[PDB]
Amino acid sequence: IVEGSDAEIGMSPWQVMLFRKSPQELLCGASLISDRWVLTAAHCLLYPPWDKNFTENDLLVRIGKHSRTRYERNIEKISMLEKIYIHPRYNWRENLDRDIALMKLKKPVAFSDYIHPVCLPDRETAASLLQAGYKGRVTGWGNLKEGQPSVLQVVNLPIVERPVCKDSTRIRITDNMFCAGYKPDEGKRGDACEGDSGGPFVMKSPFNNRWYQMGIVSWGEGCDRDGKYGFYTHVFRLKKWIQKVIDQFG
Amino acid sequence: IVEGSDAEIGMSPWQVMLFRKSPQELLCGASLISDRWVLTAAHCLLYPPWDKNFTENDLLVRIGKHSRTRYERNIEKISMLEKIYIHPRYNWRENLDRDIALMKLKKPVAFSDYIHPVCLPDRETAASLLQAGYKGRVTGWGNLKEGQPSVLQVVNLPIVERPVCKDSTRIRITDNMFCAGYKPDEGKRGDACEGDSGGPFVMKSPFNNRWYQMGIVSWGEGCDRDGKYGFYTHVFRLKKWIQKVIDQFG
Amino acid sequence: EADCGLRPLFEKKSLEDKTERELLESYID
Amino acid sequence: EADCGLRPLFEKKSLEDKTERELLESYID
Amino acid sequence: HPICEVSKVASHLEVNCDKRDLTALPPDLPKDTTILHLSENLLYTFSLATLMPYTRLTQLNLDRCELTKLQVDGTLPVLGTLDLSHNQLQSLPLLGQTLPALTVLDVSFNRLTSLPLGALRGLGELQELYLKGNELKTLPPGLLTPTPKLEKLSLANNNLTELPAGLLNGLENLDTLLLQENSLYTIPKGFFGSHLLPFAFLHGNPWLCNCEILYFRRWLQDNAENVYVWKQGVDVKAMTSNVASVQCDNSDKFPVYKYPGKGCPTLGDEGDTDLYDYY
Amino acid sequence: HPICEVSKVASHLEVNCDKRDLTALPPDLPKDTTILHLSENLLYTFSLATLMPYTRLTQLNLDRCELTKLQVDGTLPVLGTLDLSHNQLQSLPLLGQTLPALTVLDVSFNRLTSLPLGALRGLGELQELYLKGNELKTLPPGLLTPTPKLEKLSLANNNLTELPAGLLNGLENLDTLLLQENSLYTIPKGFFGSHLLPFAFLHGNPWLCNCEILYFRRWLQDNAENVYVWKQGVDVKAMTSNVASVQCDNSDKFPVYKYPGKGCPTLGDEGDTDLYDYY
C-alpha cells in the first residue's frame, strides 16, 4: 500500500495472507468470505508468462494477522488448502480479465476478534455503491513504493469513471474490472503495490453498517503514478461463478 | 581476587579502575570496550540500601594500571566521566538483576601496550563458549580473602551449570546472570571478592585468538566459600541495551 | 455468512474507525 | 573495535600467557 | 363514528374522513378499519405511528392534505396501498422499514427534486410506483433494484434530461413505463435490455437525434406497437399506439424511428451489457 | 577431454568423471569447468586445493568415493554446492575458511559420531545442510549460529537422544526440519520458539511421555498440519501430514499430542526464554 497508514487491530478481520511454504515468503493478499472459503486473484496462483503455477501443496493461508513477519501465536490461524478453483476464462494472455480464484480450506476456521468474514455484494449494494466518486478501502502488506511495512497497511481510494480508466492505459479494459484512485489534480495519493494483489477492496454500507467486498486488487502500471489508476476485479459481476463453485464443491 | 596470582604486565590491557576522587579510594573494577566507553557494574554506582549514588563528578577512571596504589606515570591514563548510563531495569531491590552500567569518557583515550579494548561477545562466540565446564578469567584489585594485593590479580574459573548455581543460593537467579567457580569436590579454589565487582570475566576464543568479555563481576555470598559460587552479569544478553545507548549517545 | 462484514472490535461495540468516517462522507459528495 | 581483544604484549607478538593455556584446554574437557 | 362515515363494503370496513377540515387524525376510529380516507384535509404534517392502533389497516389515502412533512416511525404490517399524491413534499419519505407490505405507492404531484440513495430500500413487494408531476432532473443509480416486482412505473411530467443505463435491471415483470413529457435528450445503449415491454410512453421529449440515438431508433422500430400516446380519462390498453409520437426536437415532422443518421459510424452492436458475466 | 565427458548445459560446462575407476583428480580438465562429477570412484582421500586451478567451479560431487579423509586447504571462491554423501568420513571437515560461498552441504551416510565446536564457522551463506544417516548421539551448542540463513536441515536417521535447547536460534528462514528415526526421548522447552515451521518430521522416536513432554504436546496440537511422515521418492510438499505419527514409546496407539499427562503440575508457561533481554 502506497501512502497508506497502519491498520488498527481488527479493523480488517477478513484480511488473509497467501503464504509460500518453501521458501517462506508472502505471495499475495486474499480475503475470508466464509469459514471454509477464501477469495484471491488468479494471477497470484497461475501466470504462464512468468512460469507461475502454485498448487495446493505450495501454500498455506494465514488469517487474523497484523504483523507482516512475526508468527502471531494464539491470534493468527494457519490453514491448508484443500482445492484451488481458478476461473476457467481467466485471461492472463491479454488483460488479466476475470482475475479471480477461490480457495477451499482443509478444515473450517474458528472466528474471533481478529478473524471474521467479509460480505459479498448483492444486487442492491452493487448498483447502489459502485459509482464514481464513492470510495472504498484497500489493505495489504505489499510495498510502500514501486520498502515493506512491518504491519498491515490501509488506504481509502475513490472509484473512477470508466472513461478516465479507459484512457489511462493501452490495455483493453473490461467490465469485469473497475479502477480506483485520485486524479493528478485532486491533490492526494494512494494505491496498491507489489504484494497487495489478491487483497480486497471493501466498502461500508450506509444502509446496514456492513462491509462488502466490491473488488480484488488485480493490476496496475507502476504504483501511485500520476494519471494512473489501480484496477480491481469486479467481484459482483463474477458472483454468479463464485456461488456456482461453492454450492457444488462446498 | 581470592587464590589468584600476580597478573603479568599488559595481560589485561582492558582492565579499568573506578576511582573515587575525594576521599581517594578504589571503588570498583571496570573494563575498556572502546576508546570512549567503559563498562562496569550498576551496584558500583547506585545502591539505595547503602545510600550509594555516585555521579560523574565523584569519580575518575584509571586505565592501563598494574600497581594498586601508585600513580603509574606515563603508563596509566586518567579519564573523567561525561555521562553515566545505568540500566533502567537494574534490580537492586531484589537480586541485582541487570547489574550493568555504561560510562562515556569526556575525551577518547589513546591505546598503548597497556591500554587496549576488550571484545564484546557475538551470537556465535556466546552460544559456543558460554557452556558449563569451560573457564574464563577474572581480574581485579579486590581483597585476597573475605588483605589487599599490591598489584593486579588473576584467577581462572570454570562456568557452572544453572542448577548448581540455582541451588547454591536462596536469591532468585535470573538468566541475565551466570555463575562460575570450582565445586567443593574439584579440589581447587578461586573467586572474586570485595573490590573486584564491576570487573570483567573474559574468555579467549579458540577460533580467532581474541578475548571476549562474557561477564561482569556482580555478587556472591562471601568469598570462596565451599558450595558457593560467584555470580556475573550476562553481558551478551544485555548487549542489545549496550549497543542502544552507544549508538544514540556516542 | 449471516454475520458477515460486522467487525467484532468495531461495529459490534459501537466503535468507529480512524478513517471509516471518510468513506461515508463520500456518499454525499 | 576492529582490533578488539588482541593484546599488544601477547597475541600481537606470538607470546602466550602464564595461564591462558589452561582456558583453551577446557574447550576439550 | 362521530366525525367520519363508516361503511362496510364486502369484507372491508371503509372509514371515510374526507373533506372535514381536519388538522389531525380523528380519535377513536373503528378498531377494525381496513380502508382509511383522509383526503382533502389540512394536515400539514402526519405521523404513520398514529395508525399502529389499527392493525388491519390495508389502504391509506393522504392525498390533497397540504402535506409538507410525513413522519415515518413504527410499522404498519399490512398496509398495501399509500396515496400521498397532490401534496407539498420536497423530499421522498423513506418507507421501507415501516411499510414492508407496500405494493402500490403514489407520490405524484408533489415537489420532489431528487431521490435519495436507497430511497426504496425494503419495499420488496412494490408493484406500482407513481412519481408523476414532480421536479426530478435525474435519478440515482440503483433506484429500482429493491423493487424487483415492479409492473407499473410512472416518471411522467417531470424534468428528466437523462436516465441511468441500468434503471430497469431486474424488472422481469414491468409492463407499463411512463416517461412522456420530460426533458429527455436521449436513451442510453441497452436501456430496455431483452425485456418485453407492452406499454411505453415516450412522446413529449426533446429527443436529440444524433448518432447516440441509434440504439433508441432500433428499439422503436422493433417495438413500434408497444409505443403509445397518453390520453386522460381512458385505460392505458385503450390508448392508441403510435411510434411516430416519439419525435426529434419534439417536431412531428421528424419521428425518431425514421431518423436517417447520415454519416454515423457502425451501429451493428457490441453486446447489450448484462448485469453479471457469462463467457 | 580424454578421460571425462565434457558437456555444455545452458551456460554451464558440466564435466562428468563418474565411474571411471579413478584414484585421483584427472589432469588437464576444461579450464572453464563449472560443474564437476567425481562420483563412484576410488579416491580414498581428496584435497580441495587441487581444484583451485578451476576458478569457475560452482558444483562439486564427491559422493560414493570411499572417502576417509578430505584435505581442506586454499579456497574455492565460488563453490556453492558440495556433495560428500555416501563415504567413510569419521569427522566433519571444517569448510568455513575454504568455501565462503557454500549454500548446500551434504555429508549424509558417512560415519560421523559427533560434531566439533565451531564446526560450521564461516559458512555464512549456507541454506541447506544434510547430515542424514550418520551416528550422531548429541549436538554441540552453537552448531547453527554461523548459518543464519538455513532453510533446510536434515538430522534424520542418526542416534540422537537429546537436542540442545537453542539449536534453532536465529533461523528465521528454516522451513524444513528432519528429525525422524533417531532415539529422541524429549524436546526441550521453547525448542521451536515463535518461528513458523511448515515442515517437521518427528516420527520414529522413543518419545518419553511424562510431564517433560507437555511443551512438545502443546506444540504438536498448535502445529498439527506442519507435521509429516517421510516417504521416499516424493517431494516433501507432496508427503502426507499426520501429527499422529509422533507417538509415545513409538507405539501408534499413544500419539504424543493426545498424551493426557495426569497428575502433571501446571503447564501454563513462564515464558519462552529468548536470546537477549527485553523488560
Ligand SMILES: *[C@@H]1O[C@H](CO)[C@@H](O)[C@H](O)[C@H]1NC(C)=O
Ligand atoms: C500446473 O502444475 C500442475 C501439477 O503440478 C499441472 O497438473 C497443471 O496442468 C499445471 N498448469 C499449468 C498451466 O502449467
Ligand SMILES: *[C@@H]1O[C@H](CO)[C@@H](O)[C@H](O)[C@H]1NC(C)=O
Ligand atoms: C542521585 O543524586 C543525583 C544528584 O546528585 C540525583 O539527581 C538523583 O536523582 C539521585 N538518585 C538516587 C537514586 O538517589
Ligand SMILES: *P(=O)(OC(C)C)OC(C)C
Ligand atoms: P501483486 O503482488 O501486484 C499488484 C500491485 C498488481 O501481483 C504479483 C503476484 C505479480
Ligand SMILES: *P(=O)(OC(C)C)OC(C)C
Ligand atoms: P564489589 O566490590 O564486591 C563483589 C565481590 C560483590 O561490590 C561493592 C561495591 C559492594
